[PDB]
């Protein structure tokens, strides 16, 4: 059984007990979030396609932890023009654990 949910401007195929890293959610560590924008729920030969949302479907997750991805370095270099600027980036994520998928 898997579902397709929308989280942070992106979509994920999720199963029960799966660990995900999504865009940072303003939900405290340990609290339970309920994804309502479910686009497709498949129980195995029982595919339910939302148009655009599967009516009466809910995916329940739990905020495991917050954190930052591995640092990304941003470098802008214009050759022969005496120009170079550097910049670091660490993207925030929220780790969630899919504790339930209902049709």
């Amino acid at each position: 059984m898997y579902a397709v949910i929308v989280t942070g401007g992106k979509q994920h195929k999720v199963t029960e007990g799966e660990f995900l890293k999504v865009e940072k959610l303003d939900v405290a560590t340990g609290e339970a979030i309920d994804f309502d924008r479910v686009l497709l729920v498949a129980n195995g030969e029982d595919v339910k396609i939302g148009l655009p949302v599967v009516e009466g479907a809910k995916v329940t997750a739990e905020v495991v932890s917050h954190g930052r991805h591995d640092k990304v370095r941003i470098i802008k270099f214009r050759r022969r023009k005496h120009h170079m600027k550097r910049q670091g980036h660490r993207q925030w994520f929220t780790e969630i654990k899919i504790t339930g998928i209902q049709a």
Partner: peptide, 17 residues
């Protein structure tokens, strides 16, 4: 038919499901 499943998920279904 208002289906908003994106191409990343659609390409995963076409291979795995």
């Amino acid at each position: 038919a208002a289906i908003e499943i994106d191409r990343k998920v659609l390409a995963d279904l076409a291979v795995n499901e």
